[PDB]
Design a protein around this ligand. Sequence first.
Ligand SMILES: [Mg+2]
Ligand SMILES: [Zn+2]
Lengths: 251, 1316, 81, 66, 237
Amino acid sequence: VPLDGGRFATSDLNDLYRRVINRNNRLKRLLDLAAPDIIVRNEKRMLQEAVDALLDNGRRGRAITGSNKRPLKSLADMIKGKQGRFRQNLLGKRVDYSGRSVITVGPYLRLHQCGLPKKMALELFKPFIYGKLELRGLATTIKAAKKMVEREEAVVWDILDEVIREHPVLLNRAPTLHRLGIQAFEPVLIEGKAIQLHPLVCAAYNADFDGDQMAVHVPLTLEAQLEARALMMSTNNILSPANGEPIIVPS
Amino acid sequence: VYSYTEKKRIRKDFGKRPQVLDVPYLLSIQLDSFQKFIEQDPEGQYGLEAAFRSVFPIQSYSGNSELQYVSYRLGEPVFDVQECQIRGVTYSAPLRVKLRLVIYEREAPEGTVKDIKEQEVYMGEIPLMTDNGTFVINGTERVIVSQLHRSPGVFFDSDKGKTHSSGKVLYNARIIPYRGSWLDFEFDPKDNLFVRIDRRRKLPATIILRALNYTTEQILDLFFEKVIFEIRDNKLQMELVPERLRGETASFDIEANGKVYVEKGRRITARHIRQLEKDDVKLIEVPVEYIAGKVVAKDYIDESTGELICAANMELSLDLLAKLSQSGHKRIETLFTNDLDHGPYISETLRVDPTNDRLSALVEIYRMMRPGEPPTREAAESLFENLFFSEDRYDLSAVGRMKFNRSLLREEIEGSGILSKDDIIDVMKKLIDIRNGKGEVDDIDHLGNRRIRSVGEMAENQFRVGLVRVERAVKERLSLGDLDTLMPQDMINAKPISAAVKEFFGSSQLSQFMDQNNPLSEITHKRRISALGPGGLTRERAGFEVRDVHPTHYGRVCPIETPEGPNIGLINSLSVYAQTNEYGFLETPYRKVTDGVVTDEIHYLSAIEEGNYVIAQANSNLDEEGHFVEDLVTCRSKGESSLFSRDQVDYMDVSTQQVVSVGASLIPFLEHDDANRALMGANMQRQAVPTLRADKPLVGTGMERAVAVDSGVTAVAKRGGVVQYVDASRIVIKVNEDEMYPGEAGIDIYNLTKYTRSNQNTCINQMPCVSLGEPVERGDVLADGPSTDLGELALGQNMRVAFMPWNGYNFEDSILVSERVVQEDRFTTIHIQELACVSRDTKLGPEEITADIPNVGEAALSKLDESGIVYIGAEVTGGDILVGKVTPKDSSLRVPNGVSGTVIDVQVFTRDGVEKDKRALEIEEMQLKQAKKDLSEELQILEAGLFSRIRAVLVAGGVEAEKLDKLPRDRWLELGLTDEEKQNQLEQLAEQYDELKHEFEKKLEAKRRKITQGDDLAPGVLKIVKVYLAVKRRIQPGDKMAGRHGNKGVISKINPIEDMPYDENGTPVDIVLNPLGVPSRMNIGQILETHLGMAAKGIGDKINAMLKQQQEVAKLREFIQRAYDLGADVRQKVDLSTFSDEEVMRLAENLRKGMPIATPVFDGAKEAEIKELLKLGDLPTSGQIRLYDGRTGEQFERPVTVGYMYMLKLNHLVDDKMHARSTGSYSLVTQQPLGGKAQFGGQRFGEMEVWALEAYGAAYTLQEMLTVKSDDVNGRTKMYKNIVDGNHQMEPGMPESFNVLLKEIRSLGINIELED
Amino acid sequence: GASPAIVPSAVIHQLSVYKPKDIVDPATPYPGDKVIITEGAFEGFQAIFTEPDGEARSMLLLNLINKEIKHSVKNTEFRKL
Amino acid sequence: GITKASLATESFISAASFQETTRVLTEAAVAGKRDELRGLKENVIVGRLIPAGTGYAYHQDRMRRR
Amino acid sequence: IETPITANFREGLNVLQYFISTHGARKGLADTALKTANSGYLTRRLVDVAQDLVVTEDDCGTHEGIMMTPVIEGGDVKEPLRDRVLGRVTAEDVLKPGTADILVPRNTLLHEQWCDLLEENSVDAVKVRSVVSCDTDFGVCAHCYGRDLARGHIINKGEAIGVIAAQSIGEPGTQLTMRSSIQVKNKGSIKLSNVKSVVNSSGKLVITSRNTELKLIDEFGRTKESYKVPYGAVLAK
DNA sequence: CCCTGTCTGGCGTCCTCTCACCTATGATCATGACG
DNA sequence: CGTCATGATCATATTATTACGCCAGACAGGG
Ligand SMILES: [Mg+2]
Ligand SMILES: [Zn+2]
């Protein structure tokens, strides 16, 4: 990675491989020009310890470091634990077509719908709007449609009301504890910059309104819209899966 | 009497306890510690002189050369604070040191050096502290925070219960040096005694007692008493003192003097001990089985054979008695090894020892230190003398020697920094005494065992580490060169010293970035007692007890102001009156209650002196003399509260505000809030934001003026006098003559700090609050700062609140606000963003900043000038061009997508050599013109003050009333006047005037040099353009507002004016809260604050009514006097009969928007006083007005509570959190979207959300949620084509990060594949 | 190990007159070697060494297609293999 | 116990996504152990349908065509 | 502390009383912090040990299930039979004490009407089919699980019940905490279980067993009191 | 070989936001000035 | 014209410990 300062603060792996190749080339040269009897041994010890620093740093006695106290990262520190490929990149991923803001009340909602801003609904639902523009014939190519929805002209709000209409979104509170923590709503466009969320539903999220933040996701494909309508809609989950108590208790 | 800014708006003050010690200067920890650090300090310690006299003289490797120390000196900084923050340099001062080199001769190191050389040398740059208590490291104002750590000295801990799973407690005795090797004595379940050094391998403890050259006979002489057996004609008689027999069952019938004393099968009672010591029984008779297991003390040798009869510390058998009996020994010395009294811990320890003399012990210690190498007697002596017994590698401080003498019951608190033999032997004696059952262990969290480091001591330690590295270099270049030809600047180099101190002030765990968006946040971030950092504990490891308030935090560390979350109780905040002791502990004031009378002398107690005495509580009633009016008074004796008698008390608290900190003493009615809600209220009061026009608190605590003046945001007058010229830029004070120097004629100029960027992107402004011609006193505010008003502290604004449920829009914690609030522009905060653009140096050539730019037209370039940089004043949108930049390819700086603003300030810095373009020359001419005008006005204004002094002197003694203004004004000296003090004073003013002339010449030349020169910059950058956008963010549904008690809330709907519940007068309420947050979240103080705020506004409305009708000053005097008396025995006692009919009109001009009321923390306004003040206004007594509705126009039943609450806007806004992403950039190593908001990123669909979608039957939603939308690149381009063509369908593929998992597992020796 | 490897009285005597070969080294700057470039407009590829200058420059082997033009460079200028 | 019952599986990807990855991958490396994606979390790793909801009908179809 | 806080929040609190309140409050906050730190890891380990168990058949075809009786600590009956045998398929078909008369067949889901008909006849112990005693290889059949919780009908073939089970156990882990004779109340018949008793000289019944459990059978069949009886205790009955 | 103590390996919540920081020191070579 | 001094540019890895805690399973100590 460049740090935009004329220098490369390198990753730890290139440092480790560079140490192994330095030590290995010096050992090839020392086996070339003959080792002094009981001498071709210290260099092989150094090579073994450099490879043991590369494959799993810190498992052998005291680990190495580049700067300054922190031990640098080997391969087994990229597979294991947190900050590794199993728990940070493969089981939970960062996801396109998503957004997040601060929640609020708005009690004029039916319980299968939530308020969602015009700016968030315009930025989540961009390629739907592109498809409706070049399907109705208001832009020739994709670039004219992109510049139309960047300027936000007076026709794309009608396009946006024609793409929101029967299309669920997934609302998500950030510590998801049980399976009612992800639910699916049908959006209503709001002038403003917050997510208006039905009050009874906030019994299941364990969410007050003292600065809580919720994240919305969009189901792209068709089967995911049917799963966010038949399986995950806010009217269906009125009973908890822990017991038979209703979760729509008026608070 | 009152100061003149205290006759502007005198705050009404409830409160009953008459104060005796005012609030000290709140920034005394930082300033006093760093003043202790850097100052010319004789008699050795403390300061830099301690390091320079402990690491010097560097003497060489037997080359008879020596680099000794003389003195040091800091020159002036090249840059003052403002130029340093603008440009970006450290605010440092060069540390010149006078070092001396001496070089001894041959055969006489006690002989004469042939040559010396003493000279000045440059080393390091230590950063100075500004007057606010902060450092400027790289243009960013940073604070070093005090650390709370363990006090050096002995410490007798007890590893209770958990070890060995049998309840047998251990006891360890950690000696904690200030610098050097640790030392832990402990036990084991076999009751052996084990030493260890720096948590290494374990040895039996007496191996170090042989290492101090003790024979075993002397060791048993120290650690045990003696039992004497005399062989006198019958059964080997015994000397017996019966105190050892207290509860022991004898094995025979103890008789003496022909009298049976003790029977066999019974124990010796205490009265039998009294019988035996009253009859003075000395010699008793023992059987042959009594000395069957008695342990001998010293070695007995047979005189004939020359052999050893029995070794030392050995039990005696029949044959050993038979050997020593026939050798000629009549005295036998043994030891007393009881079950309860004295265990044989030393004896079992010596039986586990394999060693036998000093040499073997030193070999074993040298072998446990450095494993597996040949020891030598010289190497073992050198190591064991350099562990504990050398001035170099081991040093208790004075704090360490005090705790080490105090916890061993010594007398002298002075000693050497190194240990000795008596010290370790007293540690082992006290450990054996604690194991025996007498004496107590020491807890950890007790604040007599927690020292407070600060900026000075930590900077001294880092500077000392830099000096030991440089002595590791000088011991190099000193005995490996030719002498005499070198000077002591070729040897010592400034790289490790400056690297060490620059790394500490630059990036440490305690040198942290100052949370600066509020005067309160500054003055409570500088007063912080952090437990973390180097030498302390860590957050994710410890623990339970250290996150808990000990009984001795009372009046030292605040109990209620601490950050909730992962570190509660580790980021403690220091209290109000809490100083720091001479050694580093905490101390707090008290009042010496002599036998009857509370004497008004203050008297500082530490944390261990508080425990022995008995302290009366702060609010105890006393009748005008000090006599306690009750005969049972609530006190606390030894960490435990109780009820004591009237005149067994020894101290009383000073004031009732001293348990709390300055964060949580601005909360009115603190005693009514539950402690959780007071914690959340203090923390959110720290997190406020400055509004556009900050008002005042109607219900304060009187602590606002200490927090405002004792911080550094207001412009406090230095010398009092008369104002001469007020302006939005500057303020000129003419100094009064009874405060004024004879020379340096003197009228002061305060250059205020106008609109500039804070660290939290707020707008640190200063507004002048004085009129013209106005008197000001010494120690008084002239210019209000951010969130100040007339010298008070106004964080948020005070608004009309009602507690009622209103149609669901305030459901959980939400807040509902009228449009009358946003129309008045009263939360409209002003933010400033800094946007930088560098001109780097790459291949194909350098870059271009000029406006001849491809791919753009008129509509972009109309807002730029002819040289790329945007104008000053051009109001831009989100996504225009500010700086046009093209590389050998458009890379112009743009406003980031979303923010508006108005460009207020443009800086251009040029690396020297590069051609300045036309706008950089425009800024250079501009700043030349500004600095030229400013220094010329300095000369003109101070010359005007000097000529006014000449006119003031020439009033008498040869006065010329007409002849004075006929001649030009620069010659007012050669007029008719003899040799007096006046011609002497005119000569001194001529000296001052010619000094100002030549000083103005040289300073204007230096300022032209500073403007004209280039600046040292990054490697390979041409010029840096910085542009300051100034957004004005108003309020909207989604911001966070909160009061001062923990009542948070997202504002949920900004209603119109008409819908608000109004009352039967006509006025709409501004904010409708929710009542249901009160009985669960027990913050009942906000309702008393609401009622007292309504009382304050009732008095303000009556003043507005009595003044709008143009009434004469008599009725205003009547009503203001009635509103200022109104209470019990209070402290205020003002009278308006000494305000003289013009101040009363101006005081009523300041009271007409409400009357400010002080309510101190635990001595506040009771309920009956609020009722009597609500009766003075014509408001209802219960505080509740009946309110109509805005929609229906018909009355709400059961009348509701209205009043004024002082609510704060927090800077968790909603157009800083809101974010959305369709398709942006993707990361490089794993093809997933980036993280964050500045990087246009997507929200983490974490692991528990994957579990929650497995928990439904949603399968396609999860498949596209982790294959199509996230990772698979061909899958997502197929998806994007399919979405813009209307075909909702996914082609799945494989995550590319799983292929990264295959490459990382495959890059090992592991062969992972994919079958079939 | 804790102490230095037990050095017997044999290798010491064997290392009393070693280096009986020639230049050898790590095969860097010699008569018929390879060396990659690092600076100049003729960099990006590799080159060969022959007779260098000494206390000034060296000898770069620049060639494209079927022609070659020598360009003396100091070894700092190039990238010693 | 549940951490030992989850580390002792016939599927090394589940026991690798749980606690210590070094011991699980070395034991499955020298044993030549062969996962067959066996349930939910391995299919969350590899990027295909969960065999729980709608993917359960898909997996019955896929296993019936084996 | 032996001297309590005699002041409420409507009146004032002086300095020491507020300090003692601060002891309590900061102890509570540190409990909540480290409590969340343990609770999240408990949910992780449970959803990683279950992780895999999918309702993969429709009838295993066994009989052996567990016995559901109402729990009796020794006071009031804490959890009754309706709240334990709600919606779970019976193991052996329950015969009312009109023996050889079937009340429910042996594969009937016990919804609310059947639970009321269990409460009326005062049924002793409805032996019921549990997940732990199933027979399905590589999964769990549908009848041994029970009602689809959060819905009304029987469980659908497929819903991953290991994950919803592990979340339902670990989700209230935020709420949890971290750091002479036998006296009867009701009236009924007297039952003894696992007792070796004998007659004393006084005419009473004395016990020669530690394993004695006393029970109070009520008027209709079930038990409302149970008492562990020690070794060598002396009964008056 | 049968305990019983020691040792060293594992593990210790989620999501988001902000900020700084990411060398300097020594040696060698070249150029300029002075003798 | 030559030598010396000063300034600028380019080049590599200690420089000469202590304040978590539990569980668990293997490795080894004692008997
Ligand atoms: Mg909340
Ligand atoms: Zn079954």
